């Protein structure tokens, strides 16, 4: 609610091409298909093959920034991106060679930041996942066994064994309920009353494990990435130690590209920003072009009024952002700073039109 | 638990009429229907058509409050509300013209506050939704492919391709489980054990994304809307800076209309209010009619007793509200204020009967 | 994790008898049933009828504590508990009179505390439930209409109308997936990809609405019920104002009945209690029988050792409870109090054996 | 995200053998099976039988640490682990004796820490589970009855009774939706609109009950287990009282075994540790082998640089761990401590190569 995400977060074309590339599989997988487009998309594999391959050797030019680096992850797919289709072409002479479109699926995961953020937390909380998983194994066979006791008599063909009744556990416990084999007697139907009750409590915890410290990590990602963009601000020599931990939870940083709009005039004032690197276009008769280490919006937050200038991203600006409360928090946190923002709430009134 | 929502939160009849209006579709959509009510409800479309149309030109009288406004949203439907049925009437001569009852569906969304509250947060957290969505695309085809490996042999008609096995992914991953095509072999049945386990972890995060900062925003909505109704209170010149941020999270403001009841006598005392605009009917022999900027309930919270007066909303009062703890928080937060509320807990005892 | 709930929380037999009473329905509802038990359980209705009826007039003796009371809820069922079966007996001569076992279902809800706790919060947050519910009505027909566009041609008998396709929305949107009518074409199958994605986000919020402030209320229930049992403690004249709000979130009060066990000797020490009313049996050679306004467990928490005495509930004690951290919080919160608890950690060592 | 879990958290072979042991059931449960492996796995039961039996008498040697102990749980299965198969062998002469592989299922639960953590909280919050469970019983039969009113006429064979319509409640309310018996009329189909809406709100609370204070307990488990490893640190005589409660929520302790790696050189610096018992291998020309009560990582966190030494677990070290923010919290929490960590950020620069 308090950020301007721009400049193509889904930027690199290395990620883009797996999307059209993998859909090239399906037409090959289908009978009664004309040979025209059958082979036309096979080229598109060769294109993406050639495309990454063109990228590839430029990636294997890893003399860029070569001081100390850990690029086993980022290289691990680019290598196999072209080898696996290549060796696939010859040994697998039949058209099944295309079934190695399991390979590009890591290419999104190659440059998928937020995926290492995922795997980071599992190596702390998997202590719980296992005891829950074992417990899920407890509750599975503890329950899957209870049915073989009963309907093996009149349902041999469906419940004439245990693992057939392990199927009907997770189908019945994991909220799904296909509808292939269902009991007939009374007692087997009684048992389900706790099953759904159980699995919705298990997953009521187990899925809870993920979002639990995940949110800690994503809420943490807004700090580790943003203890930077702190010292750059010329004013923040006076902020107390504990003051910052209160604040940085809310301040998210994103970048706007050149030419784009930051805050349009007349739209309702609801937030203020801290420019820290780049430049803007404060649309006034004398443009107050504020560069690295500036801010604007207090003119709108103190009064609660529309925007006083169409600020456009004249360049690629690394932006911060902040709504009222957490700035009202700051104005409440210290009178020493509200003074200059009161002054600035008068200076920028005349300094917007003047120089 | 601590608010009196009244005066028709679902007020404007512009929103009301889409409900009966859209149900007018269904009778037209059905064979063997008598022509009587077939056309009778077609009028009701003309009524709502005419009704908004009567409203429409009064809306196009947008000279009201015409200083600086952004009414592209609020107008965008009212225009199409009547044009699209109109042009539908002529070109689409067959009864299918009624299928443009897809149009009024925005009319609730026209004046649906809390809908902009929804879209506000997606433009900050969609950084995550995409990486999760791609990851959902990873896990889909990573898994949907695993089955074509197997049952293409003995299930051509069901699993004789990939996208047929992409159907059976989300059906199987998204908790649903229709029951159209299910495996027969063992290994294809093993794979599902992680699928439901997976999708309930994916959605265990992904649905978590929504409620995560949504609640931040709704809990924030109780501040941005309620840093107002602060300075109006004559007593709040003494409240410290950090005192308020602690409080306003709990104080929600709503309005009661004239004539309605606010707190009835004898009911158990559980909360106190701050009147800030309007007037009441404190039902006493001398009615202590307290207008803008008052409060009552401390007589019940300090003692823990029933209500001392049937307070009725004599006018349309913009109300606040507060339970004990967060007022016990205030009484604990400062002795300076509990003095006057102790005094007021004696003054209003005699001042309730007297003037 | 930090409380001893005892003395029959499911106490009153008024609540108990609906459980056996309603199961008396089913045998009447079944063909080929012998008349023996058919009428035998009809008596049990007369028993519960007579049982509450015996209770009833004693309830209508509402001269007990008759000062100011609001007993429209608690009476509203007891009246109908016996009238509705009575009038059912005569006018409904056929056995369908038993179908008024819809009536006792409120009797649990009669004395179901925690049910008013439920309805309390809906009257503050239903502002959201409606906009979400309308939004659910938006997303229903916005989506349910998209299918009639398509399969009306080759699925008249299943999708030959709109509301048939409204059925297949919530079945498909609300995680359920029966398996009655499913598409055949491609495009109708594409649409479901966002449906489950959508409904799991809708309910990802909407069910979130309930648990959101519900937990605020239940976490609040541990305060409003426990600002009592504060002043009774002889030591709590020194506790600062803000000290208490930190504490009472954790302190839950429950009651133990006479004769029961409170802490058995030798079990691992993990918590301490505050006795405020009643008496105990501190099993020592000289029983240190501590009555209203006492505590014990610091002997185990400071050392981290087993229990030093088999404390048994000699009488019905209104108990509090507290684990280490929130007491380590207290020991950390003030040196003034840890002194007496250090002294008490020596006094009760010798005073346990002596008098 | 901030811990190094190592040394075989799933360690004891008592837990390990139930996994292969129980799968020995299934081959016996199947017709047309060759007798070779039929009896081969029956030995494996005898192995695990003998294996625990070998363990058993060594467990019944409970003269180890025999001062005051409560080992009814840990013994309760080991006894039955071998008796129940034994008596099963003789009385149950037919192969059904193997159906007492319901017995080993507690053996994981024997040494499943985190399982007592589960049952601990239910004895405080089951006050809610019951009122919700009764409420679930309210909503079940309140709704399951509504359908017998309707389709008993034209669906006798499916809805010719009540409990058949109690089946179709939880199937329909608990998110599952098998697809055995579904209505035909309109009104019975209307009713489901609130059912899924209801059950997803019920479980929206009820599953919420579990994760609610569960997370309190697991977040508490990181304190009760970690008020230890506090006094061992030589520096923590100066930490204020309230300072610790802020910190210990984040500090989790785990153990690394001998020979393993702790932080490899060159990997990105993201965390620091407190060694409290054991020894390391700080891979430098002069190995700065720091034993019980040390720390490292400030060299990387103050600068934000890679690791300055391949620290390997030379012995079994009981480790703590800490990311930046909560250490930046500490550096912000006190200048008195950042001094020595500034000094240490210079001492260990030269003391890493020197002695
Ligand atoms: K389902
Ligand atoms: K199904």
PDB file of N, CA and C in Angstrom, chain B residues 87-154:
ATOM      1  N   UNK B  87     -27.331   0.495 -26.832  1.00  0.00           N
ATOM      2  CA  UNK B  87     -26.799  -0.088 -28.056  1.00  0.00           C
ATOM      3  C   UNK B  87     -27.057  -1.586 -28.112  1.00  0.00           C
ATOM      4  N   UNK B  88     -27.162  -2.235 -26.952  1.00  0.00           N
ATOM      5  CA  UNK B  88     -27.513  -3.646 -26.925  1.00  0.00           C
ATOM      6  C   UNK B  88     -28.903  -3.885 -27.489  1.00  0.00           C
ATOM      7  N   UNK B  89     -29.812  -2.926 -27.310  1.00  0.00           N
ATOM      8  CA  UNK B  89     -31.203  -3.150 -27.677  1.00  0.00           C
ATOM      9  C   UNK B  89     -31.379  -3.311 -29.179  1.00  0.00           C
ATOM     10  N   UNK B  90     -30.571  -2.610 -29.973  1.00  0.00           N
ATOM     11  CA  UNK B  90     -30.784  -2.510 -31.412  1.00  0.00           C
ATOM     12  C   UNK B  90     -29.962  -3.526 -32.196  1.00  0.00           C
ATOM     13  N   UNK B  91     -28.635  -3.475 -32.063  1.00  0.00           N
ATOM     14  CA  UNK B  91     -27.777  -4.379 -32.820  1.00  0.00           C
ATOM     15  C   UNK B  91     -28.051  -5.830 -32.449  1.00  0.00           C
ATOM     16  N   UNK B  92     -28.158  -6.112 -31.149  1.00  0.00           N
ATOM     17  CA  UNK B  92     -28.462  -7.457 -30.666  1.00  0.00           C
ATOM     18  C   UNK B  92     -29.979  -7.585 -30.582  1.00  0.00           C
ATOM     19  N   UNK B  93     -30.587  -7.844 -31.739  1.00  0.00           N
ATOM     20  CA  UNK B  93     -32.037  -7.910 -31.801  1.00  0.00           C
ATOM     21  C   UNK B  93     -32.598  -9.115 -31.072  1.00  0.00           C
ATOM     22  N   UNK B  94     -31.902 -10.250 -31.148  1.00  0.00           N
ATOM     23  CA  UNK B  94     -32.332 -11.436 -30.430  1.00  0.00           C
ATOM     24  C   UNK B  94     -32.267 -11.170 -28.926  1.00  0.00           C
ATOM     25  N   UNK B  95     -32.933 -11.995 -28.104  1.00  0.00           N
ATOM     26  CA  UNK B  95     -32.980 -11.710 -26.656  1.00  0.00           C
ATOM     27  C   UNK B  95     -31.628 -11.724 -25.955  1.00  0.00           C
ATOM     28  N   UNK B  96     -30.548 -12.108 -26.637  1.00  0.00           N
ATOM     29  CA  UNK B  96     -29.216 -12.121 -26.052  1.00  0.00           C
ATOM     30  C   UNK B  96     -28.728 -10.746 -25.609  1.00  0.00           C
ATOM     31  N   UNK B  97     -29.417  -9.664 -25.983  1.00  0.00           N
ATOM     32  CA  UNK B  97     -29.040  -8.336 -25.507  1.00  0.00           C
ATOM     33  C   UNK B  97     -29.032  -8.268 -23.987  1.00  0.00           C
ATOM     34  N   UNK B  98     -29.886  -9.055 -23.332  1.00  0.00           N
ATOM     35  CA  UNK B  98     -29.907  -9.098 -21.878  1.00  0.00           C
ATOM     36  C   UNK B  98     -28.618  -9.654 -21.293  1.00  0.00           C
ATOM     37  N   UNK B  99     -27.795 -10.333 -22.097  1.00  0.00           N
ATOM     38  CA  UNK B  99     -26.526 -10.852 -21.604  1.00  0.00           C
ATOM     39  C   UNK B  99     -25.532  -9.755 -21.256  1.00  0.00           C
ATOM     40  N   UNK B 100     -25.854  -8.490 -21.533  1.00  0.00           N
ATOM     41  CA  UNK B 100     -25.081  -7.356 -21.051  1.00  0.00           C
ATOM     42  C   UNK B 100     -25.519  -6.910 -19.673  1.00  0.00           C
ATOM     43  N   UNK B 101     -26.055  -7.830 -18.883  1.00  0.00           N
ATOM     44  CA  UNK B 101     -26.111  -7.664 -17.446  1.00  0.00           C
ATOM     45  C   UNK B 101     -24.804  -8.039 -16.769  1.00  0.00           C
ATOM     46  N   UNK B 102     -23.727  -8.197 -17.543  1.00  0.00           N
ATOM     47  CA  UNK B 102     -22.376  -8.098 -17.012  1.00  0.00           C
ATOM     48  C   UNK B 102     -22.005  -6.671 -16.636  1.00  0.00           C
ATOM     49  N   UNK B 103     -22.858  -5.700 -16.943  1.00  0.00           N
ATOM     50  CA  UNK B 103     -22.484  -4.301 -16.884  1.00  0.00           C
ATOM     51  C   UNK B 103     -22.746  -3.722 -15.507  1.00  0.00           C
ATOM     52  N   UNK B 104     -23.932  -3.976 -14.958  1.00  0.00           N
ATOM     53  CA  UNK B 104     -24.279  -3.425 -13.656  1.00  0.00           C
ATOM     54  C   UNK B 104     -23.394  -3.963 -12.537  1.00  0.00           C
ATOM     55  N   UNK B 105     -22.676  -5.065 -12.772  1.00  0.00           N
ATOM     56  CA  UNK B 105     -21.866  -5.684 -11.730  1.00  0.00           C
ATOM     57  C   UNK B 105     -20.804  -4.753 -11.167  1.00  0.00           C
ATOM     58  N   UNK B 106     -20.387  -3.739 -11.926  1.00  0.00           N
ATOM     59  CA  UNK B 106     -19.489  -2.734 -11.380  1.00  0.00           C
ATOM     60  C   UNK B 106     -20.210  -1.718 -10.503  1.00  0.00           C
ATOM     61  N   UNK B 107     -21.535  -1.615 -10.615  1.00  0.00           N
ATOM     62  CA  UNK B 107     -22.261  -0.596  -9.864  1.00  0.00           C
ATOM     63  C   UNK B 107     -22.131  -0.776  -8.360  1.00  0.00           C
ATOM     64  N   UNK B 108     -22.192  -1.986  -7.799  1.00  0.00           N
ATOM     65  CA  UNK B 108     -21.728  -2.138  -6.414  1.00  0.00           C
ATOM     66  C   UNK B 108     -20.302  -1.666  -6.253  1.00  0.00           C
ATOM     67  N   UNK B 109     -19.418  -2.098  -7.151  1.00  0.00           N
ATOM     68  CA  UNK B 109     -18.025  -1.690  -7.090  1.00  0.00           C
ATOM     69  C   UNK B 109     -17.842  -0.202  -7.333  1.00  0.00           C
ATOM     70  N   UNK B 110     -18.847   0.479  -7.881  1.00  0.00           N
ATOM     71  CA  UNK B 110     -18.748   1.922  -8.041  1.00  0.00           C
ATOM     72  C   UNK B 110     -18.596   2.565  -6.673  1.00  0.00           C
ATOM     73  N   UNK B 111     -19.631   2.456  -5.848  1.00  0.00           N
ATOM     74  CA  UNK B 111     -19.586   2.941  -4.472  1.00  0.00           C
ATOM     75  C   UNK B 111     -19.403   1.767  -3.518  1.00  0.00           C
ATOM     76  N   UNK B 112     -18.291   1.068  -3.710  1.00  0.00           N
ATOM     77  CA  UNK B 112     -17.801   0.084  -2.752  1.00  0.00           C
ATOM     78  C   UNK B 112     -16.476   0.612  -2.241  1.00  0.00           C
ATOM     79  N   UNK B 113     -16.543   1.497  -1.253  1.00  0.00           N
ATOM     80  CA  UNK B 113     -15.394   1.681  -0.388  1.00  0.00           C
ATOM     81  C   UNK B 113     -15.075   0.337   0.245  1.00  0.00           C
ATOM     82  N   UNK B 114     -13.810   0.163   0.626  1.00  0.00           N
ATOM     83  CA  UNK B 114     -13.130  -1.082   0.974  1.00  0.00           C
ATOM     84  C   UNK B 114     -12.692  -1.867  -0.277  1.00  0.00           C
ATOM     85  N   UNK B 115     -13.147  -1.509  -1.476  1.00  0.00           N
ATOM     86  CA  UNK B 115     -12.587  -2.111  -2.681  1.00  0.00           C
ATOM     87  C   UNK B 115     -11.301  -1.399  -3.098  1.00  0.00           C
ATOM     88  N   UNK B 116     -11.217  -0.063  -3.043  1.00  0.00           N
ATOM     89  CA  UNK B 116      -9.901   0.565  -3.236  1.00  0.00           C
ATOM     90  C   UNK B 116      -8.911   0.170  -2.168  1.00  0.00           C
ATOM     91  N   UNK B 117      -9.400  -0.130  -0.964  1.00  0.00           N
ATOM     92  CA  UNK B 117      -8.536  -0.631   0.096  1.00  0.00           C
ATOM     93  C   UNK B 117      -7.919  -1.953  -0.325  1.00  0.00           C
ATOM     94  N   UNK B 118      -8.662  -2.757  -1.087  1.00  0.00           N
ATOM     95  CA  UNK B 118      -8.131  -4.020  -1.583  1.00  0.00           C
ATOM     96  C   UNK B 118      -7.003  -3.781  -2.574  1.00  0.00           C
ATOM     97  N   UNK B 119      -7.294  -3.066  -3.659  1.00  0.00           N
ATOM     98  CA  UNK B 119      -6.308  -2.871  -4.703  1.00  0.00           C
ATOM     99  C   UNK B 119      -5.104  -2.056  -4.279  1.00  0.00           C
ATOM    100  N   UNK B 120      -5.194  -1.345  -3.153  1.00  0.00           N
ATOM    101  CA  UNK B 120      -4.081  -0.505  -2.726  1.00  0.00           C
ATOM    102  C   UNK B 120      -2.854  -1.344  -2.397  1.00  0.00           C
ATOM    103  N   UNK B 121      -3.053  -2.485  -1.739  1.00  0.00           N
ATOM    104  CA  UNK B 121      -1.918  -3.226  -1.201  1.00  0.00           C
ATOM    105  C   UNK B 121      -1.266  -4.104  -2.263  1.00  0.00           C
ATOM    106  N   UNK B 122      -2.027  -4.537  -3.273  1.00  0.00           N
ATOM    107  CA  UNK B 122      -1.471  -5.408  -4.303  1.00  0.00           C
ATOM    108  C   UNK B 122      -0.305  -4.755  -5.030  1.00  0.00           C
ATOM    109  N   UNK B 123      -0.287  -3.426  -5.106  1.00  0.00           N
ATOM    110  CA  UNK B 123       0.788  -2.703  -5.768  1.00  0.00           C
ATOM    111  C   UNK B 123       2.010  -2.499  -4.875  1.00  0.00           C
ATOM    112  N   UNK B 124       2.129  -3.240  -3.771  1.00  0.00           N
ATOM    113  CA  UNK B 124       3.347  -3.262  -2.967  1.00  0.00           C
ATOM    114  C   UNK B 124       3.830  -4.695  -2.782  1.00  0.00           C
ATOM    115  N   UNK B 125       2.892  -5.628  -2.638  1.00  0.00           N
ATOM    116  CA  UNK B 125       3.201  -7.010  -2.308  1.00  0.00           C
ATOM    117  C   UNK B 125       3.148  -7.943  -3.510  1.00  0.00           C
ATOM    118  N   UNK B 126       2.777  -7.445  -4.692  1.00  0.00           N
ATOM    119  CA  UNK B 126       2.771  -8.292  -5.877  1.00  0.00           C
ATOM    120  C   UNK B 126       4.165  -8.720  -6.302  1.00  0.00           C
ATOM    121  N   UNK B 127       5.209  -8.091  -5.760  1.00  0.00           N
ATOM    122  CA  UNK B 127       6.557  -8.628  -5.886  1.00  0.00           C
ATOM    123  C   UNK B 127       6.596 -10.083  -5.445  1.00  0.00           C
ATOM    124  N   UNK B 128       5.890 -10.397  -4.360  1.00  0.00           N
ATOM    125  CA  UNK B 128       5.829 -11.755  -3.842  1.00  0.00           C
ATOM    126  C   UNK B 128       4.859 -12.615  -4.636  1.00  0.00           C
ATOM    127  N   UNK B 129       3.688 -12.070  -4.979  1.00  0.00           N
ATOM    128  CA  UNK B 129       2.661 -12.850  -5.662  1.00  0.00           C
ATOM    129  C   UNK B 129       3.179 -13.446  -6.958  1.00  0.00           C
ATOM    130  N   UNK B 130       4.075 -12.737  -7.637  1.00  0.00           N
ATOM    131  CA  UNK B 130       4.579 -13.203  -8.919  1.00  0.00           C
ATOM    132  C   UNK B 130       5.568 -14.339  -8.713  1.00  0.00           C
ATOM    133  N   UNK B 131       6.559 -14.129  -7.844  1.00  0.00           N
ATOM    134  CA  UNK B 131       7.507 -15.187  -7.546  1.00  0.00           C
ATOM    135  C   UNK B 131       6.832 -16.427  -7.005  1.00  0.00           C
ATOM    136  N   UNK B 132       5.738 -16.243  -6.270  1.00  0.00           N
ATOM    137  CA  UNK B 132       4.917 -17.368  -5.853  1.00  0.00           C
ATOM    138  C   UNK B 132       4.124 -17.902  -7.036  1.00  0.00           C
ATOM    139  N   UNK B 133       3.636 -17.005  -7.891  1.00  0.00           N
ATOM    140  CA  UNK B 133       2.847 -17.433  -9.039  1.00  0.00           C
ATOM    141  C   UNK B 133       3.707 -18.185 -10.042  1.00  0.00           C
ATOM    142  N   UNK B 134       4.893 -17.656 -10.341  1.00  0.00           N
ATOM    143  CA  UNK B 134       5.857 -18.411 -11.130  1.00  0.00           C
ATOM    144  C   UNK B 134       6.149 -19.739 -10.461  1.00  0.00           C
ATOM    145  N   UNK B 135       6.443 -19.695  -9.160  1.00  0.00           N
ATOM    146  CA  UNK B 135       6.641 -20.914  -8.389  1.00  0.00           C
ATOM    147  C   UNK B 135       5.432 -21.831  -8.494  1.00  0.00           C
ATOM    148  N   UNK B 136       4.227 -21.263  -8.505  1.00  0.00           N
ATOM    149  CA  UNK B 136       3.063 -22.090  -8.784  1.00  0.00           C
ATOM    150  C   UNK B 136       3.114 -22.641 -10.200  1.00  0.00           C
ATOM    151  N   UNK B 137       3.673 -21.875 -11.136  1.00  0.00           N
ATOM    152  CA  UNK B 137       3.882 -22.392 -12.476  1.00  0.00           C
ATOM    153  C   UNK B 137       5.007 -23.400 -12.539  1.00  0.00           C
ATOM    154  N   UNK B 138       6.036 -23.217 -11.712  1.00  0.00           N
ATOM    155  CA  UNK B 138       7.057 -24.244 -11.552  1.00  0.00           C
ATOM    156  C   UNK B 138       6.405 -25.539 -11.100  1.00  0.00           C
ATOM    157  N   UNK B 139       5.703 -25.480  -9.968  1.00  0.00           N
ATOM    158  CA  UNK B 139       5.216 -26.690  -9.329  1.00  0.00           C
ATOM    159  C   UNK B 139       4.109 -27.329 -10.154  1.00  0.00           C
ATOM    160  N   UNK B 140       3.389 -26.543 -10.954  1.00  0.00           N
ATOM    161  CA  UNK B 140       2.356 -27.121 -11.804  1.00  0.00           C
ATOM    162  C   UNK B 140       2.969 -28.065 -12.825  1.00  0.00           C
ATOM    163  N   UNK B 141       3.785 -27.524 -13.726  1.00  0.00           N
ATOM    164  CA  UNK B 141       4.265 -28.309 -14.849  1.00  0.00           C
ATOM    165  C   UNK B 141       5.369 -29.263 -14.431  1.00  0.00           C
ATOM    166  N   UNK B 142       6.117 -28.916 -13.381  1.00  0.00           N
ATOM    167  CA  UNK B 142       7.052 -29.866 -12.793  1.00  0.00           C
ATOM    168  C   UNK B 142       6.341 -31.135 -12.360  1.00  0.00           C
ATOM    169  N   UNK B 143       5.089 -31.009 -11.934  1.00  0.00           N
ATOM    170  CA  UNK B 143       4.311 -32.126 -11.434  1.00  0.00           C
ATOM    171  C   UNK B 143       3.369 -32.668 -12.498  1.00  0.00           C
ATOM    172  N   UNK B 144       2.767 -31.777 -13.288  1.00  0.00           N
ATOM    173  CA  UNK B 144       1.835 -32.214 -14.318  1.00  0.00           C
ATOM    174  C   UNK B 144       2.531 -33.056 -15.371  1.00  0.00           C
ATOM    175  N   UNK B 145       3.833 -32.856 -15.550  1.00  0.00           N
ATOM    176  CA  UNK B 145       4.587 -33.646 -16.510  1.00  0.00           C
ATOM    177  C   UNK B 145       4.857 -35.050 -16.005  1.00  0.00           C
ATOM    178  N   UNK B 146       4.978 -35.213 -14.689  1.00  0.00           N
ATOM    179  CA  UNK B 146       5.387 -36.489 -14.124  1.00  0.00           C
ATOM    180  C   UNK B 146       4.395 -37.602 -14.419  1.00  0.00           C
ATOM    181  N   UNK B 147       3.143 -37.262 -14.716  1.00  0.00           N
ATOM    182  CA  UNK B 147       2.111 -38.266 -14.924  1.00  0.00           C
ATOM    183  C   UNK B 147       2.022 -38.726 -16.366  1.00  0.00           C
ATOM    184  N   UNK B 148       2.307 -37.841 -17.324  1.00  0.00           N
ATOM    185  CA  UNK B 148       2.306 -38.260 -18.720  1.00  0.00           C
ATOM    186  C   UNK B 148       3.368 -39.312 -18.974  1.00  0.00           C
ATOM    187  N   UNK B 149       4.414 -39.330 -18.147  1.00  0.00           N
ATOM    188  CA  UNK B 149       5.450 -40.346 -18.225  1.00  0.00           C
ATOM    189  C   UNK B 149       4.877 -41.749 -18.080  1.00  0.00           C
ATOM    190  N   UNK B 150       3.712 -41.889 -17.442  1.00  0.00           N
ATOM    191  CA  UNK B 150       3.299 -43.152 -16.849  1.00  0.00           C
ATOM    192  C   UNK B 150       2.060 -43.694 -17.547  1.00  0.00           C
ATOM    193  N   UNK B 151       0.944 -42.980 -17.427  1.00  0.00           N
ATOM    194  CA  UNK B 151      -0.356 -43.518 -17.797  1.00  0.00           C
ATOM    195  C   UNK B 151      -0.772 -43.159 -19.213  1.00  0.00           C
ATOM    196  N   UNK B 152       0.126 -42.585 -20.010  1.00  0.00           N
ATOM    197  CA  UNK B 152      -0.159 -42.437 -21.430  1.00  0.00           C
ATOM    198  C   UNK B 152      -0.396 -43.789 -22.089  1.00  0.00           C
ATOM    199  N   UNK B 153       0.201 -44.849 -21.543  1.00  0.00           N
ATOM    200  CA  UNK B 153       0.053 -46.182 -22.110  1.00  0.00           C
ATOM    201  C   UNK B 153      -1.381 -46.683 -21.986  1.00  0.00           C
ATOM    202  N   UNK B 154      -1.867 -46.832 -20.750  1.00  0.00           N
ATOM    203  CA  UNK B 154      -3.166 -47.448 -20.489  1.00  0.00           C
ATOM    204  C   UNK B 154      -4.258 -46.431 -20.193  1.00  0.00           C
TER     205      UNK B 154
END
